Design an enzyme around this catalytic site. Structure first.
Site, PDB file in Angstrom:
ATOM      1  N   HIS A 107       0.954  -1.259   0.091  1.00  0.00           N
ATOM      2  CA  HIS A 107      -0.091  -0.002   0.136  1.00  0.00           C
ATOM      3  C   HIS A 107       0.950   1.065   0.042  1.00  0.00           C
ATOM      4  CE1 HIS A 107      -3.490   2.397   1.065  1.00  0.00           C
ATOM      5  NE2 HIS A 107      -2.722   3.243   1.728  1.00  0.00           N
ATOM      6  N   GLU A 108       1.685   1.198   0.931  1.00  0.00           N
ATOM      7  CA  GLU A 108       2.673   2.461   1.046  1.00  0.00           C
ATOM      8  C   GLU A 108       3.643   2.794  -0.066  1.00  0.00           C
ATOM      9  OE1 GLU A 108       0.408   4.294   4.119  1.00  0.00           O
ATOM     10  OE2 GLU A 108       2.193   5.306   2.965  1.00  0.00           O
ATOM     11  N   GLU A 151      -5.646   7.194  -2.604  1.00  0.00           N
ATOM     12  CA  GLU A 151      -6.076   5.899  -1.590  1.00  0.00           C
ATOM     13  C   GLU A 151      -6.445   4.986  -2.295  1.00  0.00           C
ATOM     14  OE1 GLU A 151      -3.879   7.904   1.631  1.00  0.00           O
ATOM     15  OE2 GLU A 151      -4.278   5.763   1.186  1.00  0.00           O
TER      16      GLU A 151
HETATM   17 ZN   LIG Z   1      -2.567   5.475   1.775  1.00  0.00          ZN
END
Ligand SMILES: [Zn+2]
EC number: 3.4.24.89
Length: 185
Positions: A107-108, A151
């Site tokens: 994710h990061e 996101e």
């Molecule tokens: Zn994020």
């Protein structure tokens, strides 16, 4: 592997098997994308303590992350962040370890890929259109994955890359997002 130079393990003592497991999961990200990350001076730092213990992130100590006033939360509590360095705490990969992602390190890292490799592809009209149609399917009301295309990009790319089961789930639930990810990766 590019990960031997891109992934920076702690100089002090660290959980060997957990750091190896995280390093192995980062191999799900295509090598060409990992190569490109390294060329931009990106480092993926797996930390044994709080991410704020890293010299370059110490400035965040005791600072409230945006949107979190009155909750007692500071950056010291945050298990992962992505700026020009990707810092992820060892042992905090799974959903519920101070975050709600399928996989913290993927994710990061995908935020750095979006910003520094793909010219903010999450902000393109094409991706915005996809986000407006499909981010609500799994993430409605979260004020996060359903609120920000960056996101949705990072989390939907995580579903695509993590496993065959999560990818099949994405294909069925968010077909326009699956199509975009397949074309990208
Ligand atoms: Zn994020």
């Amino acid at each position: 592997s590019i990960l031997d130079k891109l992934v920076v393990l702690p100089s002090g003592e660290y959980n060997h098997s957990e750091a190896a497991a995280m390093k192995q999961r980062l191999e799900k990200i295509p090598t060409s994308i990992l190569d490109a990350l390294y060329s931009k001076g990106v480092k993926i730092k797996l930390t044994q303590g709080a991410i704020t213990n890293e010299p370059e992130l110490a400035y965040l100590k005791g600072v409230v992350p945006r949107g979190w006033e009155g909750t007692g939360l500071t950056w010291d509590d945050v298990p992962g962040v992505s700026e020009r360095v990707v810092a992820v705490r060892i042992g905090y990969s799974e959903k519920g370890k101070g975050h709600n992602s399928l996989n913290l390190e993927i994710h990061e890292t995908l935020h750095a890929v979006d910003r520094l490799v793909l010219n903010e592809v999450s902000g393109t009209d094409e991706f915005i259109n996809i986000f407006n149609k499909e981010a609500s399917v799994k993430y409605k009301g979260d004020g996060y994955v359903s609120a920000y295309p960056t996101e949705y990009f990072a989390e939907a790319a995580s579903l695509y890359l993590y496993s065959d089961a999560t990818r099949s789930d994405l294909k069925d639930s968010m077909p326009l997002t699956y199509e975009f990810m397949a074309k990208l990766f």
